[PDB]
Amino acid sequence: MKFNENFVWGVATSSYQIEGAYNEDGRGKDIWGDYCSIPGIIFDNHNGDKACEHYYRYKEDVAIMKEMGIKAYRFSIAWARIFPEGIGKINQKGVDFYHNLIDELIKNDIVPYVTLFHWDLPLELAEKGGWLNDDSVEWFKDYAEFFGKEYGHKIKYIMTFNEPQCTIGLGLQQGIHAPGVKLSPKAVLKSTHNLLKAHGAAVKVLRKVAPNTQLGINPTCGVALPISENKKDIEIARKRYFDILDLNDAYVWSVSLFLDPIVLGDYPTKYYELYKEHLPKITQEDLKLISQPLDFLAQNIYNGYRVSEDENGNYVYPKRKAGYDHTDMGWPITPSALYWGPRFICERYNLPFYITENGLACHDVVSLDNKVHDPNRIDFLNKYLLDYSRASCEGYDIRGYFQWSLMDNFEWREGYSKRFGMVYVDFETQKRTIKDSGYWYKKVIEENGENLLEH
Numbered sequence: 407m408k409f410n411e412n413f414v415w416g417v418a419t420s421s422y423q424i425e426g427a428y429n430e431d432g433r434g435k436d437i438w439g440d441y442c443s444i445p446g447i448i449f450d451n452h453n454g455d456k457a458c459e460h461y462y463r464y465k466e467d468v469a470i471m472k473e474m475g476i477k478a479y480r481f482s483i484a485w486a487r488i489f490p491e492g493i494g495k496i497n498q499k500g501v502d503f504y505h506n507l508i509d510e511l512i513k514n515d516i517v518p519y520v521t522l523f524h525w526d527l528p529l530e531l532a533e534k535g536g537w538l539n540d541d542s543v544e545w546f547k548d549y550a551e552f553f554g555k556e557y558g559h560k561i562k563y564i565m566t567f568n569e570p571q572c573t574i575g576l577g578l579q580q581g582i583h584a585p586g587v588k589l590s591p592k593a594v595l596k597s598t599h600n601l602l603k604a605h606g607a608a609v610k611v612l613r614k615v616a617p618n619t620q621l622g623i624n625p626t627c628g629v630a631l632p633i634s635e636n637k638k639d640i641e642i643a644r645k646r647y648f649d650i651l652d653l654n655d656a657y658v659w660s661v662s663l664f665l666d667p668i669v670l671g672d673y674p675t676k677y678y679e680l681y682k683e684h685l686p687k688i689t690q691e692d693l694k695l696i697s698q699p700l701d702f703l704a705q706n707i708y709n710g711y712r713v714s715e716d717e718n719g720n721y722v723y724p725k726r727k728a729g730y731d732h733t734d735m736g737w738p739i740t741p742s743a744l745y746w747g748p749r750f751i752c753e754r755y756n757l758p759f760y761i762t763e764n765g766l767a768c769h770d771v772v773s774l775d776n777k778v779h780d781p782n783r784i785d786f787l788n789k790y791l792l793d794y795s796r797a798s799c800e801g802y803d804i805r806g807y808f809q810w811s812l813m814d815n816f817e818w819r820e821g822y823s824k825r826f827g828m829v830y831v832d833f834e835t836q837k838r839t840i841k842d843s844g845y846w847y848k849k850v851i852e853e854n855g856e857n858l859l860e861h
Contacts (some may be wrong), residue, residue, distance in 0.1 A: 408795040408855040414517070414806025415851040416478030417471065417826065417828065418763055420524040420568065422454045423815035425484060431499040434490030437536075437577075438711040438818070441584035441851040452821030453784070458813055461503060468510045470829055470838055474848040478517045480762060480808045481507075482524030482568065483589035485549055492528035493545055501556060509562060518761035519762075519808070520561050521624070522550055522608065525577075525584065532585060537574070537597035550608035551615055557617025565762070566605045569706055574598050575658030583818065590852035591653050594679070599686045602654050602667050602696045602777035609698040623668065624762040627661045629710030629743035629750075633724070636737045639714070646721060647750050648711045652675040659771040661751075669755045702805065703755050706763035710743030733786070734767035734824055741789035745797050752802045759803055764790055765810040767817070767824040772839060778830040783843040788858050795855060809847065813838065 422428075422438050429435075442453035460467055471479060485492065487500035511518050523546070527536060531545055541546075550566070567573070575585035579594045589597075609621050632643035648666075651657040662674045672693055680686065714722045731739035748759050766786045770778050787809060789801075798804045813827035822833055829845040849857055 407799070408791075408858060409798050409804075411854065412805070413798075413854060414478045414620040414760070415476065416480055416517075416519065416806060416808040417476055417812035417848075418480035418519075418808040418810045419460070419812050419815065420482040420521065420526075421484035421487070422457070422524070422526040423811070423817070424458040424460040424467075424813065425487075425787050426455065428453075428455045430461075431487075431503070432490055432497040433484065433500060434486035434492075434497075434507065435487045435585040436484070436526040437529055437532045438526055440529050440532070441586055443585070447586065448819060449821035449823045452816065455818045456833070457816050458833070459836050462675045463836060464503075464507050465510055466838065467813070468507075468514055468516065470840065471516060472514045473829075473852050474844050476516060476848075477851065478519055478806065478808070478814075479511055479812075480519040482521035482526075483553060484526055485523065486526060486528040488552065488620055489528060489549060490530075492531035492534075493548060496552070498547075504557065504775040508557060512560060517563070518561055519563045520553075520565070520726040521568045522546075522553065522564060523573075524765035525573055527573075537578075537583075537600045537604075540600060542600045543607050546604035546609065547607040547611050551611045554614075554616035556621065558612070558619050561616070561619055563620050563622070563702075564612060564616070565622045565704060566608050566623055567601060568762075570598075570601055570664055571626055571659050574601060575656060579658050580656055591657075591681065592686070594658060595681060595684055598663065599688065599692070602664060603692055603716065606695040609700070610695065610762050613698075622700050622702040622704050622757075622760070623665075624706055624760070625661065625664050626706035626708075626763070627659055629707055629740075629747040630713045631710040631740065631742055631746055633712050633714050642690050642715055643713050643746065644750055647746075648674070648754060650674050650680060652680065665703070665751075665755065667693060667696045668756065669700070669703070671698070700757055702749060702760055703757035704760040704762040705747060705751055706810070707743050707747045707761060708764065708766070709738050710740040710746065711738075734769045735820075737766070739766070739786055739789070741786075741793045743793075744790045745793035748794065748802060748804060749800075752804075757803070758791065758805045760805050761794065761807045763808060763810040765826050767826050770803045770814070770825045770830060770841065772830060776839070777840050778841040780828075780841045780843050782845050783828070783841065787847070791850070791855060791858055792860070795858070800857075831836070
């Protein structure tokens with residue numbers, strides 16, 4: 407019994423990365439399409455105008471998902487495809503599209519998992535300040551309210567914000583993601599506060615208009631890994647994993663900054679002390695709105711880092727061995743992150759836990775045999791599921807795993823130079839090719855993980 411019988415095996419995509427049709431059927435502009443229009447921002451000036459054309463080819467992608475026997479599909483809704491201006495007028499062809507997509511999923515016995523916001527903020531609301539605007543809490547509530555009223559009767563799982571660490575940190579504090587700016591701590595924490603408030607308002611209104619839909623959120627962070635399994639070393643990694651970082655660091659990359667207000671009802675104590683001169687207006691109704699009860703907690707986990715302390719109690723980060731296992735991103739391959747991550751999150755928050763994203767980039771090619779061989783992805787996934795199974799076997803309330811991605815897509819700043827899918831996509835012909843990892847993943851679902859090679 408590596409995993410439980412109810413375990414959920416899924417793949418994950420996002421709207422801007424696969425859909426295409428950025429300027430068709432009344433879809434409004436968003437921040438990433440706007441971000442891409444700045445020359446030199448994206449690798450080779452790629453954009454998401456066409457992407458994988460999933461908007462037009464969704465039936466084929468669902469047929470491919472049935473071919474691999476995938477029972478759950480995580481995807482995101484393009485806010486600008488339903489509300490071209492963020493608020494007000496409804497774009498029916500965008501409403502019809504997600505109807506056609508959802509119906510195709512149900513028709514093929516695939517359970518939809520919906521992400522409301524996957525970074526594609528409607529450009530009209532960004533030009534109104536984005537998450538700096540206190541009205542953004544209402545913009546997202548009305549967005550969530552319409553989606554719950556229109557689709558709640560056939561969507562059982564909804565998560566609000568995918569990886570707010572990127573939207574806030576890379577987008578507004580580090581200038582790495584859209585809109586690409588580096589704002590003040592006041593702006594960043596005010597933007598953080600309104601995003602959390604928008605999350606809670608979305609949860610509260612979805613309990614009213616879609617009461618049979620389970621709600622959650624999937625943040626992300628590097629997983630602090632203990633140097634050994636001694637209680638003294640595990641506590642160092644646990645403290646770092648939920649720490650609040652200094653203002654001169656990339657302080658948005660914190661687990662507790664977002665999830666402690668959501669699950670525990672307030673920011674950590676360190677937040678009020680370190681950020682005292684940059685604190686936003688925080689009322690108790692704010693914290694009450696943010697801390698709505700959730701049905702599940704999720705997390706995108708890709709890698710982790712060893713962490714320790716010296717004599718003075720300062721964090722020490724040991725080097726990685728020369729030639730260490732890595733991906734086409736240069737990211738390290740650390741399968742133990744899928745154990746310590748879920749373990750730390752479950753112990754601190756005690757909610758049903760999903761892994762919403764896990765995977766790696768591989769320099770995949772269509773070989774001479776017209777197949778795509780990615781055994782490195784098979785090894786990466788197999789090793790990560792082994793440590794994830796250990797957490798399930800140890801009694802933690804683990805519910806599922808969504809492998810990023812289903813198909814190669816637009817990898818943001820990297821464009822199409824990085825391939826994360828188990829399905830190969832030639833971005834000219836739009837020809838799909840299932841990789842060896844896809845057929846291997848089909849057997850994993852059918853065996854519920856009892857085929858995972860050990861050691």
